[PDB]
């Protein structure tokens, strides 16, 4: 996997890519890695999938309902307080890696969690088997006061370079853009390098090619 | 909370009485919408009344009212919202629909209604919403659990002739305006003091309202249905009316 | 192990308006095979869940997914679509996150309001894994991958739909050594359901 | 990481580097290990990083409702809350801290707490896997009652020495200075704290 | 001397049980202790007296992974190598 | 009346009466006063003498908390013993968190939340004892008094009992006379007349004076009882003014 | 009157009515005296029979060799403070090596006491109790009442027509108190004294029961034979 | 007896809750400037062995958020340990400081829990918090014993709560917040309606004030009282 | 606790014909960093008693919170307490017995020797060791650590047996504890140059002679040694 | 953590007519290191008789501690009953079954 976040001079990119794989083999080419924790708070994980997606639903539910609670735009800094508390309480047993990004009425936050509970504040941040690749690009091509649209083409880049050179992270780029004074700006599939090679033959069967000892028509 | 000899139970006539003392509240179903309707009273001319909404949004497709005691309402506003998400949202990765969560918020009353130590609430809610399947929904729900639909329906101290008046005006072709223009001729009939877009408050559960979800780019999602008219979209109606 | 023990097939793919699920029939204790009838599809109303695993977790979750799906159509008075059905099994496996049931299962049925196809697959501890071409469980899981990859194309109709997925099952079976004594492929329509088996290998 | 806190005459400065490493990885090269656990009270965070974090939240939220209900803790007060923290939980918790604050009746103190958690009062501590390499350096340069620039220069000296010595060390040198004045952040870059 | 792991996140997980939740993998479970004195209740003090076919191939131990890894979940590596 | 067969109950007045009827208890308590110091506090109190068959001088009616904190009740005593059992445990507790002695603020914060709590459910009586307490912390001297509706102030001069009105309009002439406050040494004495004119109103039996203090000087900032010379020095003081 | 059942209400004069007729309840009970000298402690108690053909009740509880107990009021309440005086005891020896002392166990038993006062349930003991033990610091008598109030005393007798025990005992304080080196004048002022409290009966020997402690003597109790030479 | 319904539907135990908050014979005001907020409230001494500094009704909750009560001191201090306590957790729990309006939200639902089980009688007391708030600015939330709140443009309780009212009211009509330019200034303001509503003139020591300003709730001293005091008589 | 991190080396306490002498050095080690040289191992807890504690710092710290405690709460409703009915060494030791063997039982052990030093009120030597695991005994002569096989050698030589008491003078005792001072900072690596001496008598009281150093040390044969073999 | 030890003691007891004999060592000890010299491991126990409870000493003295604590409990009830040596046994018996794991 490979995630990235950007901020910039108006607010935060977080990019990721889509293969989704389990052992060597490629379950999913098009999983969609980033996960609204709220409309403008948007995280990524890696580690067990399955604890990132039970953790980042946790988190949402309860956000949602202390917004509604208080009345106010949820921070980004409730929803990591919230989620490393969580974490921490297992002891990293959820072995849920994020990096959560997000706009509220303090700025632009970009957050990085860790299974046993530890976060990090930062400009640019990276994720994932793809991790090392991706830091690379944000190393040699990041600024301060990047514009929105330098930004996207950094995290953009920084994710094509975590997918040409990593095994466990391909496909396609999904960026989302968040920004100070309007709504998020979800890009699925903002790039598509990898479309698929063409078939040399069809290799549909003639109807009756298989062997059939029993039909029947089920009640359901 | 017992029966009394005469099979009634005996402390939620009292609580039924208490909403009675409510102000009035409204609800309408258009055949394209749902309306909800309250007048909200002031403690001083220094309280900013625009700190209290009588409407609140239960999820995205719900949203409720009240007449009666208010910080009942509160407590059990929030208690819906945590059993809406808890019990449905995390199981089944969407919102329960109106039937659902009004059934939930009923359990919550009647359990006041069947355990010692606790008074039932003293609310009666108005809880519209829309669903995939049941389409759109109108409940009221009254301090002993009991709820039943209704097309049209008023609680409070101006509950008989407000009932009165939308079987009058309520038919089975209403659209939503018609509907809101109904709701607001008859509190406007119900309201004894000053009548304008802050003393009164309008919810609709209609149409999708993307403009609210907060994001864009995910096709799928349609955002609220319901929302609150503003103090100036009210005013507009009023002056229209 | 206790996903090999049992070995198991599921495979389910998505023609054009239809959906397809299939297993095989085999039951056995790693080497021994002990039973040709153990059919790994079950449905609740119009959406099928294939469970691939070890067999007692299969039937425990036939049993608590049969008990929750009735109270939904009870208490909702409306079958559980394909979507809500994959998100109550995603939350029912994560419940035991320290404890998990050794399972994979593979949800396939059409939305009835919408008429789409759906399928989507899980890991132990319910990680959704919604895929729009087609889902793969089991011992064979690699062969089926290539298999299906190989044979699967876009809006197949419900023949060839039929065929694609009994000749990727068939060839995927005969190369798993824990996987085969026949087999069953169900056709979903939008108004029916064809459950066929298949002849094949009985070794 | 290398830490280090030195009282001086009109206060204490309390300084750390900024690289964060998982294995030879600098996972982060600008992190801030300073932390301000209440006005005049800083801790810097050694050992595990959760560990320290969730430490130093139980620790502001105990020293905040110390300070609601019975008015300004001292340094004292919040290096004590640290230990009871670190010592009911030692088996559990991996964290040793430096607690450094300002209270005008003490001017400024300094406490560690190393991994066993006990605490200890000393004039100067440096704490982190950087710091090794310094306690030759700093036993024999630390002077009682030094003058704000130089404690800085000799904080600077310290963990410039601790940077080039040490792999998980490393990036800006950042201080924070406790006085009566107030408190006054300052970073220092390396290519001014690696030619000295 | 070693470096610093700051998250923990090179952090690795009696011997563990292979496939967590079944007691009847559970070491303590799958090999018993003995009876302090089944010498003296049985003989000879014991209550009681494979993968891979023709071709040679050529999965992980619980005990090196890292504890939020289940076996046979799908896992991506947080940080990679 | 009415309303005032159960603890948690407000009246139509607004009044919880039940706690009422309990500052009616301390009303029918022993003297007890204290009084702060230039650099420190003094408590006294009467201990009437039932009976010859008591051991004079070992039936205390003061009670020391920590180690800085002086208590001292009128009312129902074992009540007393209750709360200054609560107090101890209570500044057990944050000298285990914390270090430093806790705090006479913060004990009286934790003593009147207590004694509040008692007054909140029916299923408990309210504290039958209107307690003095004071020490010595780093911000010098502090003497609260705290009555049985939880309510606590913090004084110059206190008392509490049967003769509480006469010992307070002596104390308020006292913190008149001494307007640049009162010594150690010099409120000790002070307070033995005060409790002896206390006792005038009360005179049908007799008594025995018990005195304690805290000072930053003469114990240095430790809490402890009046004895032999000083003692007889205070009482030949006492008996020489009211005679 | 409306306040009086209930322990968690105070009176409108501020009087606790339940626990004043648990005071009542030792008014019922029989008499026992106890008095001390600088070395001795001794207790002396008139046992009751319910019958003619009925043995009488054992109103004297040993603690341990330094301390025990007498009882006046409903004996199950005296076997529950007995057994919890014996439960702090052994605490302390076994945690401490320390013999409790008497005024530490007087005002435990004060403050166990006191709790049945204040939380709604309990009912107040309807038992009194004196106390006597010799310690590192010498002999000591304590009286203990329902309310919680202990009281350390160079002598006393509680139960029905104490108060004449009592008279004596304060008429003859100047002397007893002043019994050195001998047990036997102790015991002879006391059972001179109990014999006070005597109507239409007198102290016999299946009657009175006699205690004692002190530097050179581990608690015992005479009783019958051995208390023949006293009666 | 009990918080339970009379057959008028009223709970006549949370009406005499009510009637307990005049207990103490105080009267409070509070107002809102352009950049503060502002408390006034009656410092009753009638004992002279009292330590003036002791008596108080004026808490401070947090950092920036200030409470006022109305009603039994023993009852206040409750309150406003347990307001400590809520802003604590709610800082630890969400990571930034709790805001004004929703701490008063709390604190009205568990007076409501008091209004609902018979087991516990409520608070006979009105808390006032007071706030600039890090979004909503300056910020005034009364609280009463039937779990009931709301926000304020300005604020008075007490036994002559209905005479300070209708100052406030009549100065906000003849000009929503006070034009004032810094927080002493708005001070000596709500002292003048102090002065002119109750129609008594106060020493030093029969004033408490506490200010709320961005990132300090602050309670001022007897001096300076003395300050704004003369600056009035200036 | 399951591992000591930062440890005192050793305490080692003889009794003599009038009372008790004991001495630690303050040196408190993480592992071979001799990093922490100002602790103090010698806890009195009143005029007859001093407590001695090796082991974790951590846990030492603990056990003189204890030990705090436990004056301020006999204090307690006893008007007695400063002259008799006071905390006695026996007390001390055995309240301490008790705790380190209850944490021994959960498993959850307190790493710490503990020597408790004194004399009871009628004059009688009390002088105890226990260890974590609750093991206690008594002996004319107490050591922990190195100090159990270096120093205690030396202070037997000198009582050697009970009937040794009474001939064993103040002086002698306090040399015979300097020169296992001494001996002990020789060979023992995790020993330091600065030690605390008490005294405990039972005519004057305790004394408390801290930060002492060690003296006369024997170095200048070292010049001659010319390495392994030639 | 090894909670156990071994100190290192010898007991001894014999029985005939008219007297029984419980003979014990003082030495105490922890691996070669003699602990102390006299360390009584026999003991009166009233009651005309004698324990030991030899063995790891930590437990010993607790072994020993909760028997006098059982023994003085049954003089509390029994009416300051002399305890025979078959109740001593079983009493004991009891005490170490308790910690049967």
């Not at chain 2, 918020?105 to 009647?110: D, G, L, S």
């Not at chain 6, 029918?28 to 068959?53: M, P, Q, R, Y």
Request: aromatic share 10%; net charge negative.
């Amino acid at each position: 996997t490979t995630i990235v976040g950007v901020k910039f001079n108006n607010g935060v990119v977080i990019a990721a890519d889509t293969r989704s794989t389990q052992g060597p083999i490629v379950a999913d080419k098009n999983c969609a890695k980033l996960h609204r924790i709220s409309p403008k708070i948007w995280c990524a994980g890696a580690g067990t999938a399955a604890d990132t997606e039970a953790v980042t639903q946790l988190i949402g539910s309860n956000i949602e309902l202390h917004s509604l609670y208080t009345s106010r735009e949820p921070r980004v800094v409730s929803a990591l307080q919230m989620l490393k508390q969580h974490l921490f309480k297992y002891q990293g047993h959820i072995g849920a890696y994020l990096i959560v990004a997000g706009v509220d009425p303090t700025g632009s936050h970009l957050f990085s969690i860790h299974a046993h509970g530890s976060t990090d504040v930062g400009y640019y941040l990276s994720l994932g088997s793809g991790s090392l690749a991706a830091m690379a690009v944000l190393e040699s091509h990041w600024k301060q006061d990047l514009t929105k649209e330098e930004a996207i083409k950094l995290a953009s880049d920084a994710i094509q370079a975590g997918i040409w050179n990593d095994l466990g992270s391909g496909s396609n780029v999904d960026v989302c853009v968040m920004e100070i004074g309007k709504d998020a700006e979800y890009l699925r599939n903002y790039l598509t390098p990898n479309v698929r090679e063409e078939k040399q033959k069809s290799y549909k069967f003639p109807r009756g090619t298989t062997a059939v000892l029993k039909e029947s028509i089920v009640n359901i | 909370t017992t029966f009394s000899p005469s099979g009634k139970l005996g402390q939620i006539d009292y609580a039924l009485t208490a909403v009675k003392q409510g102000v009035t509240s409204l609800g309408i179903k258009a055949t394209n919408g749902v309306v909800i309707a309250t007048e909200k009273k002031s403690s001083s001319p220094l309280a900013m009344s625009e700190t209290l909404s009588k409407v609140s949004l239960l999820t995205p497709d719900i949203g409720a009212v009240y007449s009666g005691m208010g910080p009942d309402y509160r407590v059990l506003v929030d208690k819906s919202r945590k059993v809406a998400h808890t019990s449905y949202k995390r199981i089944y990765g969407e919102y329960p629909p109106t039937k659902l969560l009004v059934s939930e918020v009923a359990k919550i009353m009647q359990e006041a209604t069947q355990s010692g130590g606790v008074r039932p609430f003293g609310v009666s809610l108005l809880i519209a919403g829309h669903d995939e399947f049941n389409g759109f929904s109108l409940y009221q729900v009254d301090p002993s659990g009991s709820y039943f639909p209704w097309k049209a329906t008023a609680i409070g101290k101006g509950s008989v002739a407000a009932k009165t008046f939308l079987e009058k005006r309520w038919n089975d072709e209403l659209e939503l305006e018609d509907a809101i223009h109904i709701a607001l001729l008859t509190l406007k009939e119900s309201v004894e003091g000053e009548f304008n877009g802050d003393t009164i408050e309008l919810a609709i559960i209609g149409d999708e309202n993307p403009d609210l979800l907060g994001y864009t780019g995910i096709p799928t999602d349609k955002g609220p249905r319901f929302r609150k008219l503003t103090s100036q979209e009210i005013n507009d109606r009023l002056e229209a009316l | 192990d206790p996903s090999s023990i049992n070995g198991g097939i599921v495979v389910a793919m998505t023609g054009k308006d239809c959906v397809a699920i299939a297993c095989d029939l085999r039951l056995g204790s790693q080497s021994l095979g002990v039973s040709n009838k153990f059919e790994k599809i079950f449905h609740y109303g119009h959406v099928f869940l294939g469970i691939t695993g070890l067999a007692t977790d299969v039937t425990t979750l036939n049993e608590m997914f049969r008990y929750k799906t009735n109270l939904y159509k009870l208490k909702e008075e409306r079958a559980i679509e394909p979507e809500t059905f994959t998100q109550l099994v995603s939350s029912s496996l994560y419940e035991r996150r320290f404890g998990p049931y050794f399972v994979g299962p593979v949800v396939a049925g059409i939305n009835s309001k919408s008429g789409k196809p759906f399928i989507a697959g899980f890991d132990l501890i319910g990680c959704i894994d919604e895929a729009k071409d087609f889902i793969v469980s089991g011992t064979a899981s690699d062969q089926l991958f290539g298999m299906c990859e190989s044979l699967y194309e876009p809006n197949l109709e419900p023949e060839d739909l039929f065929e694609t997925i009994s000749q990727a099952l068939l060839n995927a079976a005969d190369r798993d050594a824990l996987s085969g004594w026949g087999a069953v492929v169900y056709i979903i329509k939008k108004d029916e359901v064809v459950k066929r088996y298949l002849k094949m290998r009985q070794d | 990481t290398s830490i280090m806190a030195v009282t001086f005459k009109d206060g204490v400065i309390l300084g750390a580097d900024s690289r964060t490493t998982t294995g030879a990885y600098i996972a982060n090269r600008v992190t801030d290990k300073l932390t301000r656990v209440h006005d005049k009270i800083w801790c810097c965070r050694s050992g595990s990083a959760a560990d320290t974090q969730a430490i130093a939240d139980i620790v502001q939220y105990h020293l905040e409702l110390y300070t609601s209900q019975y008015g300004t803790p001292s340094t004292e007060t919040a290096a004590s809350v640290f230990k009871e923290l670190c010592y009911e939980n030692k088996d559990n918790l991996t964290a040793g801290i430096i607690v450094a604050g300002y209270d005008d009746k003490n001017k400024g103190e300094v406490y560690t707490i190393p991994l066993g958690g006990s605490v200890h009062k000393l004039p100067y501590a440096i704490a982190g896997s950087g710091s090794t390499f310094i306690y030759g350096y700093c036993d024999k340069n630390f002077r009682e009652n030094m003058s704000k620039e130089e404690t800085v220069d000799f904080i600077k000296h310290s963990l410039s020495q601790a940077i080039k010595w040490d792999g998980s060390s490393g990036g800006v040198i950042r201080m924070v200075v406790l006085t009566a004045a107030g408190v006054e952040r300052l970073i220092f870059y390396p290519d001014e704290y690696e030619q000295l | 001397p070693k470096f610093d792991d700051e998250y923990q996140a090179q952090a690795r997980q009696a011997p563990l049980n292979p496939y967590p939740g079944l007691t009847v993998t559970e070491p303590s479970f799958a090999n018993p202790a003995g009876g302090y004195a089944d010498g003296d209740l049985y003989p000879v003090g014991t209550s009681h007296p494979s993968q891979g076919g023709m071709i040679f191939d050529p999965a992980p131990r619980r005990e090196d992974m890292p504890p939020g890894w289940m076996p046979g979940s799908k896992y991506d590596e947080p940080f990679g190598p | 009346t009415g309303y005032d067969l159960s603890n948690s109950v407000f009246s139509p007045d607004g009044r919880n009466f039940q706690v009422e009827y309990a500052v009616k208890a301390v009303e029918n308590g022993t003297t007890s006063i204290g009084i702060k110091c230039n650099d420190g506090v003094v408590f006294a109190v009467e201990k009437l003498i039932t009976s010859k068959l008591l051991v004079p001088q070992k039936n205390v009616k003061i009670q020391v908390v920590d180690r800085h904190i002086g208590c001292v009740y009128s009312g129902l005593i074992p009540d007393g013993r209750h709360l200054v059992n609560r107090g101890r445990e209570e500044a057990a507790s944050f000298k285990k968190l914390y270090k430093t002695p806790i705090p006479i603020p913060a004990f009286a914060d934790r003593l009147g939340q207590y004694v509040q709590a008692h007054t909140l459910y029916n299923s408990v009586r309210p504290f039958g004892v209107s307690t003095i307490f004071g020490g010595v912390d780093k911000n010098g001297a502090h003497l609260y008094m705290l009555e049985p509706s939880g309510s606590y102030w913090g004084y110059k001069g206190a008392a509490t009992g049967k003769g509480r009105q006469s010992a307070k309009a002596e104390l308020e002439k006292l913190v008149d006379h001494h307007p640049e406050g009162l010594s150690a040494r010099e409120a000790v004495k002070q307070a033995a007349k005060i409790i002896y004119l206390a006792h005038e109103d009360n005179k049908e039996k007799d008594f025995e004076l018990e005195i304690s203090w805290c000072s930053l000087s003469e114990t240095n900032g430790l809490h402890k009882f009046v004895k032999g010379d000083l003692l007889q020095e205070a009482i030949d003081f006492a008996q020489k003014e009211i005679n | 009157n409306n306040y009086d059942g209930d322990t968690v209400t105070f009176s409108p004069t501020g009087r606790l009515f339940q626990v004043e007729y648990a005071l009542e309840a030792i008014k019922q009970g029989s008499v026992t005296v106890g008095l001390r000298s600088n070395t001795h402690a001794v207790l002396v108690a008139l046992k009751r029979n319910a019958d003619e053909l009925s043995s009488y009740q054992k109103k004297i509880i040993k603690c341990d060799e330094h301390m025990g107990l007498s009882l006046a009021g409903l004996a199950p309440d005296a076997r529950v403070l007995s057994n919890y005086l014996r439960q702090q005891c052994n605490y302390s020896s076994l945690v401490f090596n320390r013999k409790l002392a008497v005024e530490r166990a007087g005002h435990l038993l004060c403050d166990k006491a006191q709790k049945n006062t204040q939380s709604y349930g309990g009912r107040p003991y309807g038992v009194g109790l004196l106390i006597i033990g010799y310690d590192k610091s010498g002999a000591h008598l304590l009286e203990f009442q329902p309310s919680g109030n202990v009281t350390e005393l160079y002598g006393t007798a509680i139960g029905a027509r104490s108060q004449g025990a009592k008279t004596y005992l304060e008429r003859t304080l100047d002397t007893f108190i002043k019994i050195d080196g001998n047990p036997d004048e102790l015991i002879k002022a006391g059972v001179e004294a109990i014999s006070q409290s005597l109507r239409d009966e007198s102290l016999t020997v299946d009657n009175l029961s006699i205690a004692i402690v002190g530097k050179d003597t581990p608690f015992t109790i005479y009783d019958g034979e051995a208390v023949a030479k006293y009666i | 007896h009990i918080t339970i319904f009379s057959p008028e539907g009223r709970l006549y135990q949370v009406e005499y809750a009510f009637k307990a908050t005049n207990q103490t014979n105080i009267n409070s005001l509070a107002v809102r400037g352009k950049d503060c907020t502002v408390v006034i409230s009656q410092k009753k001494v009638p004992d002279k062995l009292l330590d003036p500094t002791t008596v108080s009704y004026i808490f401070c909750i947090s950092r920036t958020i200030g409470m006022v009560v109305n009603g039994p001191i023993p009852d206040a201090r409750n309150a406003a340990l347990r307001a400590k306590a809520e802003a604590a957790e709610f800082r630890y729990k969400y990571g930034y400081d709790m805001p004004c309006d929703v701490l008063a939200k709390r604190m009205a639902n568990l007076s409501q829990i008091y209004t609902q089980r018979a087991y516990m009688r409520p608070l006979g007391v009105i808390l006032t918090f007071v706030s600039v708030d890090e979004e909503l600015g300056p910020s005034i939330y009364k609280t009463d014993p039937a779990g009931y709140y709301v926000g304020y443009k300005a604020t008075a309780t007490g036994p002559k709560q209905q005479e300070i009212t209708t100052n406030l009211e009549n100065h906000f009509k003849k000009s929503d917040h006070i034009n004032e330019e810094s927080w002493e200034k708005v001070v000596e303001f709500a002292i003048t309606h102090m002065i002119d509503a109750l129609g008594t003139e106060f020493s030093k020591n029969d004033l408490e004030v506490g200010v709320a300003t961005k990132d300090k709730f602050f309670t001022l001293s007897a001096e300076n009282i003395e300050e704004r005091l003369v600056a009035i008589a200036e | 606790t399951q591992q000591p991190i930062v440890t005192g080396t050793s305490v080692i306490s003889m009794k003599y014909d009038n009372g008790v002498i004991i001495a630690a050095d303050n040196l408190g080690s993480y592992g071979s960093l001799l990093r922490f040289n100002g602790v103090e191992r010698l806890i009195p807890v009143g005029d007859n008693t001093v407590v001695g504690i090796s082991g974790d710092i951590s846990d030492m710290q603990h056990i003189e919170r204890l030990l705090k405690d436990l004056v301020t709460e006999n204090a307690y409703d006893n008007p007695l307490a400063d002259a008799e009915e006071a905390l006695e060494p026996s007390y001390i030791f055995e309240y301490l017995a008790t705790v380190m063997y209850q944490r021994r039982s959960k498993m959850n052990p307190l790493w710490n020797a503990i020597i408790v030093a004194g004399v009871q009120s009628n004059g009688d030597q009390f002088l105890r060791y226990v260890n974590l695991l609750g093991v206690t005994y008594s002996s004319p002569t107490l050591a922990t650590g190195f100090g159990a096989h270096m120093a205690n050698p030396l202070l037997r030589k000198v009582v050697d047996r009970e009937s040794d008491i009474p001939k064993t003078t103040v002086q002698v005792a306090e040399e015979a504890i300097v020169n296992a001072m001494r001996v002990l900072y020789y060979r023992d690596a995790r020993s330091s140059r600065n030690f605390s001496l008490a005294i405990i008598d039972k005519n004057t009281g305790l004394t408390f002679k801290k930060n002492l150093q060690v003296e006369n040390m024997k170095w200048d044969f070292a010049k001659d040694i010319k390495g392994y073999g030639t | 953590f090894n909670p156990y030890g071994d100190n290192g003691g010898t007991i001894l007891g014999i029985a005939g007519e008219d007297f029984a004999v419980l003979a014990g060592d003082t030495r105490n000890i922890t691996d070669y290191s003699i602990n102390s010299r006299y360390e009584p491991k026999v003991f009166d126990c009233g009651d005309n008789i004698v324990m030991s409870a030899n063995g790891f000493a930590a437990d010993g003295d607790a072994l020993v501690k909760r028997f006098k604590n059982s023994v003085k409990w049954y003089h509390f009830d029994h009416n300051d009953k002399k305890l025979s040596i078959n109740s001593a046994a079983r009493n004991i018996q009891h005490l170490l079954y308790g910690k049967r794991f």
